[PDB]
Amino acid sequence: GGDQRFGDLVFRQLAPNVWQHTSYLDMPGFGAVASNGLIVRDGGRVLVVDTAWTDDQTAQILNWIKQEINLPVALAVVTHAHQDKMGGMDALHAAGIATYANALSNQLAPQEGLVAAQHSLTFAANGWVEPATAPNFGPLKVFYPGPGHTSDNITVGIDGTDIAFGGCLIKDSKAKSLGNLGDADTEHYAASARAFGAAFPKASMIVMSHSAPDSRAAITHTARMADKLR
Ligand SMILES: C[C@H](CS)C(=O)N1CCC[C@H]1C(=O)O
Ligand SMILES: [Zn+2]
Ligand SMILES: [Zn+2]
């Protein structure tokens, strides 16, 4: 279709200023598993959502940005303390990029075998990021929907687009399962999925970690599967 290959990664333009990055990691019982994040150009800078699985892959994301956009990466926000989302933090840091995560992600990252972000986000009781903790986030709208896939999972909308990113909270409309639930909050998951949908009620393109972009039926379907856990 429109997928651009760059080394071992894939880049898909979703909107004029927005690309999805995709990287892969072998896992037993699963094969080579895709993880998606985002790249957003905001004026004269670039914003990244999530690393790739590894430092090397993350450096390749930066190389793609250099080749295709050739503007500084002002910051990255990473959406929970798992390897697919934070595996590449040292590559961002080597590159001089300021990093942000949920406070709880930074607290958990060491024991997860991950490097913490440099800056912690905290969230109002209504789930919206406290805006003073997310300086220079431009069009990124960061929302904590409650515990679900993990206790620390956060989501991101993009102002001026029809896109909302569910990270590993949301699976596609035909997904057979919710994946590994080892760190999940099975009581709260369905509500958290629905809270994501309600935070971004206008988004028609739902982007997520482990499926291609889908309609909002991804949210309804994920929530319906999560209903079965409680
Ligand atoms: C390591 C990642 C973190 S979200 C994971 O748990 N995955 C990646 C694909 C599905 C699921 C699994 O192993 O069940
Ligand atoms: Zn995860
Ligand atoms: Zn994941």
Residue numbers in the entry: 41 to 270
What does the literature reporting this entry say, word for word?
The bacterial metallo-β-lactamases (MBLs) catalyze the inactivation of β-lactam antibiotics. Class B members, known as the metallo-β-lactamases (MBLs), are structurally distinct from the Class A, C, and D enzymes, require one or two zinc ions for catalytic activity, and are not inhibited by currently approved therapeutics. One variant of significance is NDM-4, first identified in 2012 (17). Although it differs from NDM-1 by a single amino acid substitution, namely M154L, it demonstrates increased enzymatic activity against the carbapenems and several cephalosporins.
The crystals of the NDM-4/l-captopril complex utilized for this analysis were also grown from poly(ethylene glycol) 3350 and belonged to the P21 space group. This time, however, there were two monomers in the asymmetric unit. The model of the NDM-4/l-captopril complex was refined to an overall R-factor of 20% at 1.3 Å resolution. The reverse turn in the apoenzyme structure that adopts two distinct conformations (Ala 55 to Val 58) is a distorted Type I turn in the NDM-4/l-captopril model. In both subunits of the NDM-4/l-captopril model, the region delineated by Leu 65 to Ala 72 adopts two distinct conformations, labeled A and B as shown in Figure 3A. In conformation B, Cζ of Phe 70 lies within 3.6 Å of a carboxylate oxygen of the l-captopril ligand. The sulfur of the ligand lies within 2.2. Å and 2.1 Å of Zn1 and Zn2, respectively. The bridging solvent in the apoenzyme model, as well as three additional waters are extruded from the vicinity of the binuclear metal center upon l-captopril binding. As a consequence, the coordination geometry surrounding Zn2 changes from octahedral to distorted tetrahedral shown in Figure 3C. In addition to its interaction with the binuclear metal center, the ligand also lies within hydrogen bonding distance to an ordered water molecule and the backbone amide nitrogen of Asn 220. The determined Ki for l-captopril was 164 μM and 210 μM with a corresponding LE of 0.37 and 0.36 against NDM-1 and NDM-4, respectively.
